[PDB]
């Protein structure tokens, strides 16, 4: 009777920090999985935010639809969050061909390869970023996406910025 998987992650986070802080952006993934042979892909993406766009229009119902031509033609990913392909990869953690699904993820240890363009020490499970001695340049919008067996199952945006140039983000559906 059961089939598939379910994930939820509270798709709205905001974090305010001063320069030189050692804050940790941690997200709480909640999951229920069947069909024990599965593939997990916890991915952290980044996009710089422009203060000139007060409404940061995240067209959230684009990640689930894989080949919407209408999505990836906004002339650029300037201050609107289009398909995750237009964002830059920050962290990638892959649990490939994981078999022991019924319990804690500490039983299926996988790898976490991160592009060194950023610092961003990675932590447990690859579900959280630990920012160490942060410069002001790292301010922006970080997004967490989870691929289950190749399809997006949950996505939670988080706005990381200082007090000076802090911008709000409004999620939208469609387009």
């Amino acid at each position, epitope marked *: 009777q059961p089939r598939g998987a*379910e994930f*939820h992650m*509270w*798709n*709205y*986070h*905001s*974090h*305010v*920090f001063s320069v030189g802080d050692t*804050f*940790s*952006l*941690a997200m709480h993934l*909640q*999951y*229920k999985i069947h069909e024990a042979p599965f593939d997990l892909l916890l991915e952290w993406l980044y996009v710089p935010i422009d203060p000139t766009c007060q409404p940061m229009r995240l067209y959230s119902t684009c990640l689930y639809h894989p080949n919407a031509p209408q999505c990836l033609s906004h002339m650029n990913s300037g201050c609107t969050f289009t398909s995750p392909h237009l964002a830059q990869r920050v962290a990638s953690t892959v649990y490939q061909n994981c078999e022991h699904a019924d319990n804690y993820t500490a039983y299926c240890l996988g790898i976490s390869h991160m592009e060194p363009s950023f610092g961003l020490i990675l932590h447990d499970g690859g579900t959280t970023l630990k920012f160490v001695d942060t410069p002001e340049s790292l301010s922006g919008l970080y997004v967490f996406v989870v691929y289950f067996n190749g399809h997006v199952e949950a996505v939670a945006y*988080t706005v990381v910025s200082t007090v000076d140039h802090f911008v*709000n983000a*409004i999620e939208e559906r469609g387009f």
Partner: antibody, heavy 121, light 108 residues
Framework: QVQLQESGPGLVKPSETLSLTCIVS????????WSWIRQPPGRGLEWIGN???????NYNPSLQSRVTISLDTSKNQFSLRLTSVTAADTAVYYC???????????????WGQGTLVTVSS | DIQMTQSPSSLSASVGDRVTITCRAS??????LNWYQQKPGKAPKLLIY???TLQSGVPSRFSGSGSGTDFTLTITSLQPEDFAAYYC?????????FGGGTKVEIKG
């Protein structure tokens, strides 16, 4: 079996900065969300915002530019600040915790005693 | 903002009657709402979480059911102590929002 107590002023003049401090006992602080909830005297109660133990502050967008939530884990407390309080903010303010570890389990389980905040001259 | 519609607004049933209250949402929120009981003057208490699970220390006459966009709270047999008001609150999407509330009055 945790308990929460509010220690904010009962009367605030209009166009001021309301400040409340919630003090927690029983647990420590750590692996739970901590939230504030507003309720007008007659209307249904509404959510204002919550905070994780490491920043990560989620805000109700209807009133976001005016609300700030801070954490005082060293003193086992968390504070709420609302600037430019209008007449509509007169309400009962509760501080509570959000927890649960299961697919759908994210309840507002343990609520605080709540305090009444009114604006007048 | 997911709108939560709670029905009915006010009801009156005698002692021991089966009380049913419905909660509807604008979008699918799978087993991600909770039912709370607020007695007058006191702070709201958690009755049901995960839309189907009983909070510890709650009498079994409170039952939660439903999923997706339709949920239901049931009091099996009313008691003179169940006179409070009831709210349904979603947790799937920020901002987490509450329902309009239902006033259960005893007519026994």
């Amino acid at each position: 079996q945790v308990q929460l107590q509010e220690s904010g002023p009962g009367l605030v003049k209009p166009s001021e900065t309301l400040s409340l401090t919630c003090i927690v006992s029983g647990g420590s602080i750590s692996r739970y969300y901590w939230s504030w909830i507003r309720q007008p005297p007659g209307r249904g109660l509404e959510w204002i915002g919550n905070i994780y133990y490491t920043g990560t502050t989620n805000y109700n967008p209807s009133l976001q530019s005016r609300v700030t939530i801070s954490l005082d884990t060293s003193k086992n407390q968390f504070s709420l600040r609302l600037t430019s309080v209008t007449a509509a903010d007169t309400a009962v303010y509760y501080c509570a915790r959000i927890g649960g570890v299961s697919f759908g389990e994210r309840p507002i389980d343990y609520w605080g005693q709540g305090t009444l905040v009114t604006v007048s001259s | 903002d997911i709108q939560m519609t709670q029905s009915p607004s006010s009801l009156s049933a005698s002692v021991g009657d089966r009380v049913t209250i419905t909660c509807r949402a604008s979008q699918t929120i799978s087993t991600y709402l909770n039912w709370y009981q607020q007695k007058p003057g006191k702070a709201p208490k958690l009755l049901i979480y995960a839309a189907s699970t009983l909070q510890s220390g709650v009498p079994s006459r409170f039952s939660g059911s439903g999923s997706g966009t339709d949920f239901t709270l049931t009091i099996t047999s009313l008691q003179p102590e169940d006179f409070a008001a009831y709210y349904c609150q979603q947790s799937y999407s920020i901002p987490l929002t509450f329902g309009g509330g239902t006033k259960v009055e005893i007519k026994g």
